[PDB]
Amino acid sequence: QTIYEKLGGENAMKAAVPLFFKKVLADERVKHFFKNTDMDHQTKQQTDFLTMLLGGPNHYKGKNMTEAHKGMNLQNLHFDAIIENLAATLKELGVTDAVINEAAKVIEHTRKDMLGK
Ligand code: HEM
């Protein structure tokens, strides 16, 4: 069983990513980083990245997490906000706390790759 399957597979991921962006783009700590972002493109990259990271098909062709956030000098409070919004998204979509934690635990390894770049 992969975390991707536990979350409900492809239709669940396609629902979760725009709901995660709806919470990110409402969060004072991080919404402004997206001011000039093409959000259709970013929906596709982020769906492909999370799907690959959580054990679904690997079709991610984007940048690595240092390149993706290069020159943003992101701080720990920004990464906490992204995790909090993904957790709130998956909870609103009916995922149990155990599965949200498994997913967060994988994503958390990316923190050192993108902070302070
Ligand atoms: C730490 C707070 C974070 C902020 C403020 C943030 C913000 C951003 C922004 C502004 C861009 C794109 C610049 C543009 O193309 O318009 C980007 C690219 C990306 N971010 Fe983040 N991100 C953060 C954390 C995360 C996390 C935790 C992940 C994955 C778990 C992630 C995955 C990505 C991916 C896949 C891209 C796309 C790279 C590509 O287009 O090739 N980010 N991010």
From Swiss-Prot:
GO terms for molecular function: heme binding; metal ion binding; oxygen binding; oxygen carrier activity. Gene3D superfamilies: Globins. Keywords: Acetylation, Heme, Iron, Metal-binding, Oxygen transport, Transport. Heme binds at H69. Binds 1 heme group per subunit. Its cofactor is heme. Pfam families: Bac_globin. Monomer. Belongs to the truncated hemoglobin family. Group I subfamily. This is Group 1 truncated hemoglobin.
